[model samples]
Target chain A: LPSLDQLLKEQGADQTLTDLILAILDRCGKIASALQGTSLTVDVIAENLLRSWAQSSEGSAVRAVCSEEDIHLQECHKNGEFILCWDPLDGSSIIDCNWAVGSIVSIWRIGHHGVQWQGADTLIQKTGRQQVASLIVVYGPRTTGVVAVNVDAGGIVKEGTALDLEMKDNGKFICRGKPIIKPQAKIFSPANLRAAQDLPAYKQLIEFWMEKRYTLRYTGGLVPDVYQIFVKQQGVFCNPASKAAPAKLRMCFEVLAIALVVEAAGGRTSNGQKSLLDVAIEHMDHRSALCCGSADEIKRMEETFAALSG
Target chain B: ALPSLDQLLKEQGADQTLTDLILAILDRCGKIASALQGTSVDKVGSVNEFGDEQLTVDVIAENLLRSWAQSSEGSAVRAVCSEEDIHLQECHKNGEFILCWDPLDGSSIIDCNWAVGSIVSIWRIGHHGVQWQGADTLIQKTGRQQVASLIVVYGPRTTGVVAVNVDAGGIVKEGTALDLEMKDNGKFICRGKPIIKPQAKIFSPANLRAAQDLPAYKQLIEFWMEKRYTLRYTGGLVPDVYQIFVKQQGVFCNPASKAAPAKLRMCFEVLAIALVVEAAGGRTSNGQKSLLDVAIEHMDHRSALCCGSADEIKRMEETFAALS
Candidate 1:
């Protein structure tokens, strides 16, 4: 087992690249330490991760993106500046027992906005059909590699479509350590709403489901939570805190990973309102409704909610 | 892919495995018995805890499976608990016509107006007996030990009843609603509310009632259509009594009045639903007495019933005794 320094020297990767990866890891450590059993959200972690990014001169570009969008974000510190979202730690792969959800983050790339990170529009620019080179940190009993796949008009380069998270079916996604032939069709949701009013919607959905015949599952951790759904073949889940259980933290990131994974698996993703993909927030820290599942199933679900009485 | 007997016989050019299909019926019956894992119709135990409160695990899985079938495009399926998934698995085919559902029909049959579905006991040859509980049997090893245990009557209006031996008209089979009848205590399971008792003062919702009907059911018609009466009907029986389990107004349906359960009863359905409900935090009965403590006469396993909580059910017992 060669040390990281030796591997860096062998691959001819500069010390600067190693520093970038280490910086992100440091941010994750801090954010994880803050995780609580009851209250946490995507914004909470994003704030922590972004706080670190803003420290770097080039990374500060993310702040500008939020400013330009004029959207308010909780945990104002975490939006990526020159930030890149990683499937932060694709935790232990699951093949037995229940499954483990590999914590996932969009790994937003710090776009070329302005200096104080003011120009948010510059964050993502589509060139045909791909995002730039981003990284993945697969951790388990043992991780095989820090896989990176860059998307372009031509599709996945370097690795085959297996690692590429396009809508295609064949890509490899590990639920815990096991490979799920077909990702779960259920949409996992945590029905916790912070406000008295916000709860009705969540409650109604829950009540509706209880009266109906269906199944569900949920986890608070965005990265690990999603991986759990992946392996259990269970649906994704998030419980927005209501007045009874107010938001101790934000949940936008969980929604993000859920949206991404569900969409990638040919399922629809949403938060009660709007598609995650359609949402391009000036501030990455902002939160919203999101869900994911088979495209047709999601559409029906959305319609069902829309048609439902309050 | 393996063909369903109905399907194989069609394509086999006279060499269809009809005989094999017929023989598999016994095995299918056995699986039905094996799968009836002693559900506590009264209420679910902690061991039976299904994640609740915020679309946790149960709703999502059910929705996903439902969506797979309800979608505009893709594999379409009917509502029934057959070994369709396994049938497809063994044959290496896309198992499209299958449904994963629970034992009793709920708001799905009433509110969403979907189908009523449930799993019934299928006893084996040796296991077969009038005393059999669906939960005490094992699946058949010979032939096809599976059957379409669930139900889906996807007609134009989503109208359908799911029960055992009651599929096609002229077929009569008795189903034991796990929580229906008397609870483990041997009493008629009862609700805590009122059953829309048939009355002389009729506020007719449909004047059509005036147009026909002999005197006996005329009272039944008014019971459901009465204006001042609490007009409550939970499409499924468990839910009807489950409302009582929640301590709300009790419920009822007189075969003499409403077009329900044909021969089924409020006592039975509520007992079944209350079994699970009480197991949670509620109670139920036949508007006559405590369900868990009542002794039953199984004259018609599929017929006339009433139920609620102890007090409410006892009151009903008085009400009925006085009338008789």
Candidate 2:
């Protein structure tokens, strides 16, 4: 690994600019790696990360700081182009029923805000970051740490870090399209909590999806739940995100946390309106969205929201 | 304006019946508290109350039981002193005092269907209601009748200067009535205890919530805890709130977004136990602004994470800063 001094010399810049550029890339990479986990622990931790952050409480954790483990990472956004999101750790449930949730979130971009009308066939296909080079790390059984960087449209021109020249580790990112199996549509909502309420269109869509006599495995939270679907290649993990009032009061950054994690884990995420990975939020706290795992399953859920004009 | 038992019957044209019931409510309530308190004491289950205004099982006395040795020590008197006992005495279908329950137990209990008075028309949420009602409604809007409103609590010491010479606000006292006093009681000074524990255990119901529900307390709580140890969900909230005040610990017994707290006279009551703890040289929240600056809505009583110390609450103020 080249020294920060060497990277600064190679980039032909002062320490400040060079340091800033490199730190961002490292964040992006970690957020990406976090999204790539497949094991139960990874998935559970990921979901916990999302749940934890969704809480008004997780917003307190410093964004531009290193992990408690002392791993330096930062979250960055530019021009409000892409809404920032995160999921700390996912697999908290399996560890002594001590499942931890993360700061999972949804990022609704300006263009697609309230457009698809939240009807059936409306799983919005989100556009990934124009220049995202990131991932996240699991701090513990129930903690997830996310670091995503939004590179300028032009591209990455340099890299460096406190420990080593970040680029020396080939810190630049490349998307990995891996196979994943999320939970089945049937077991998505525990006790069928959502469908049981009997919201007509929602009921129809949920019932249609679960016709396969699917097995139930709804690990609550962002990291673990999304991880289960992303890593296992097992089945579809349907979250059927919607715009209910309770959910209405929510902040978008909450959803962004989970959506970012899902995308990282080689799975699909969406607001019933569009692909969660694709939507670019203009505002940080706007609510009303739907999320799901797997491309086909995500599309089906989208269609339901499309029919309802959600 | 909570419709007192008298008002409800008056509206229904059952004024005489309501008068009788109102009288009975107080009569029976005293018996119930005396019975319960005695039984509790006999069983060696001595609950606690601080000199400050608190609403724990013990502080429930402020809202329900009254003391009377027929002397100055009304708080500790085994016999119920005033009709304040009416706050207890929830009647069953049979009109029996079926174990009085404190309605301000939390949001879950706040919505427990029966957590209301007979005059359902008059619903009074604590914070805004007390501030709004006690001063304006009964005086300016509704003609004054009874000079007594049972919700307010004055404690730690009973101000005694003879009825005429007394301040006339009511009986006042000094010194926390609860057992868990801070080591610094003699000075009556308070510490700027950080809201966080140095490194305590945390127990959350996060496992029960779904993915999108993950932002615990909208991140306000995490931000609140950034500077302290988080001793969360340690059995009972009374104990938790008390710990923060006396031990200078920070505990979040309820989620940050819950609505029941809207009924709090103020978060201070939940925090009052701790305030008493803090006043004894310990620290609790300045007992300042109600959570979220939300005015208590009609009949919405609940508890929230009570961050202790103005200095410590910065843990959360900073959280909001980053979020903004």
- TM-scores, chain B, all models: 0.31, 0.35
Error of 2 at A65 (Å): 9.2
The per-model lDDT (C-alpha) reads 0.30, 0.31
DockQ of candidate model 1: 0.02
Query: Which 10-residue window of candidate 2 chain B scores lowest in summed lDDT?
Result: B156-165
- Per-residue accuracy of model 1 over B99-146 as CA lDDT, tens digit each: 223333332121111112232212112211212223222222210121
Query: Stretches of candidate 1 above 4 Å error?
Result: A1-81, A84-105, A110-150, A154-188, A193-204, A211-216, A219-224, A238-258, A272-274, A282-285, A293-297, B1-324
Regions more than 4 Å wrong, model 2: A1-97, A103-192, A195-198, A238-252, A260-266, A278-282, A307-310, B1-324
